[PDB]
Structure 1
Amino acid sequence: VNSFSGYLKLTDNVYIKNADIVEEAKKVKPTVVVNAANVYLKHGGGVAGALNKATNNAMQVESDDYIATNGPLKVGGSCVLSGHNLAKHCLHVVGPNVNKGEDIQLLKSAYENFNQHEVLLAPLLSAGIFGADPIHSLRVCVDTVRTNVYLAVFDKNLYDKLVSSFL
């Protein structure tokens, strides 16, 4: 039993809710919140900008030190950093950004990072300003992630389309 509330169950291990991931993280304090990161960990907008703003820019400060030491992530890759006031840990995952021309096949690799964590609160990778079809992202999630994932979808209209079209 865990503390996630109000989710619709899609499969054995995937759950979904119309929610603001920032507010959801603030209330649940999950072990892992996933950020929709880019390779430079520049958290300017979308989910990343919202999560970073909620940390009062501490996420960005930590991220800048990470990049200065380690260099950029790979598209499809991830790193574990602090969850600050939102979670124990933040798993920064880089899905492909269609608006930069990156290969959508890398979306499966991106979701594979979730399998290293037993339970996660996450957004749909490559959705929103990353330009992929969220219906496709949900399908890849369900077909790739085997650990327990709680998906937060900010847009109510999109949430209803994802549920109604789910096979």
Structure 2
Amino acid sequence: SFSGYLKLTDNVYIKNADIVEEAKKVKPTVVVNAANVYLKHGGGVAGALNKATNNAMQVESDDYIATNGPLKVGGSCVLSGHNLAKHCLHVVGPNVNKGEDIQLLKSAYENFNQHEVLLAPLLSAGIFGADPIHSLRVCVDTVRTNVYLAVFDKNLYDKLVSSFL
């Protein structure tokens, strides 16, 4: 199972780790992707997860979008986890760099409550432009299921742990 995580609350855990390396190691039931509404996995966590699947995640995503249309900001879809997990929960957090409503971050984290345990990144953090300290706060105040957060950046991980209320 998950190892080396620091417990933040009854159900939220955090580790300074590469989510791709963490997923390849643990092979969780659910890995969360920091997706956009188009499921175009170009950069950040999405680009890294997609590259680990040898682009199979993008091929599957394009078929999903061709059939269903784009997701909503704050929404999600369950697709295959390929070589990383049983499933990938593609969750769309608001992209602050696109002027998307940050109040949608709580709606995005609510998607995690449909899964008993997840390996996940901080939603809307990184290239999505939101404050990662705010994202962690929304995570612990919204998610009731067991979430194992992988924070790639060591300096951000230390800042998140040392500032956690």
Q: Please tell me the TM-score bracket, short chain as reference.
A: over 0.9
For each residue in 1:66-114, what CA deviation from the matched residue of structure 2 results, as whole angstroms up to 9, or x when unmatched?
Answer: 0000000000000000000000000000000000000000000000000
Partner residue, 2:93? 95
Q: SS at the partner of 2:94?
A: coil
1:14-49 CA distances to partner (integer Å, 9 max, x unpaired)? 000000000000000000000000000000000000
CA distance in 1, matches of 2:75, 2:115: 14
Q: C-alpha displacement at 1:159, in angstroms? A: 0.1
Q: 4+ runs of 1 displaced by more than 2 Å?
A: none
Distance, in Å, in 2 between the alignment partners of 1:12 and 1:44 is 34
5 Å-filtered alignment, 1:49-128, equals 49-128=47-126
- Give the distance between the partners of 1:100 and 1:6, measured in 2 at CA: 35
Task: Return the offset for 1:60.
Answer: 0.1
> 2:101, 2:76 → 1: CA distance?
17
Structure 1 runs not aligned, ≥5 long: none
Deviation at 1:164, TM superposition (A): 0.1
Partner Cα distance (2:101, 2:114) in 1: 23
Distance of 1:53 and 1:16 partners within structure 2: 24
User: How far apart in 1 are the matches of 2:100 and 2:58?
Assistant: 24
TM-align CA RMSD:
0.1
What SS does structure 2 have at the residue aligned with 1:104?
coil
Distance 1:50 1:102 in 2: 23
Alpha-carbon distance, 1:160 to partner? 0.1
SS at match of 1:152: strand
TM-score between the two structures when normalised by the length of structure 2: 1.00
- The Cα shift of 1:50 comes to 0.1
Q: Deviations over 1:109-135 (max 9, x none)?
A: 000000000000000000000000000
Partner of 2:30: 32
TM-score normalised by L of structure 1: 0.99
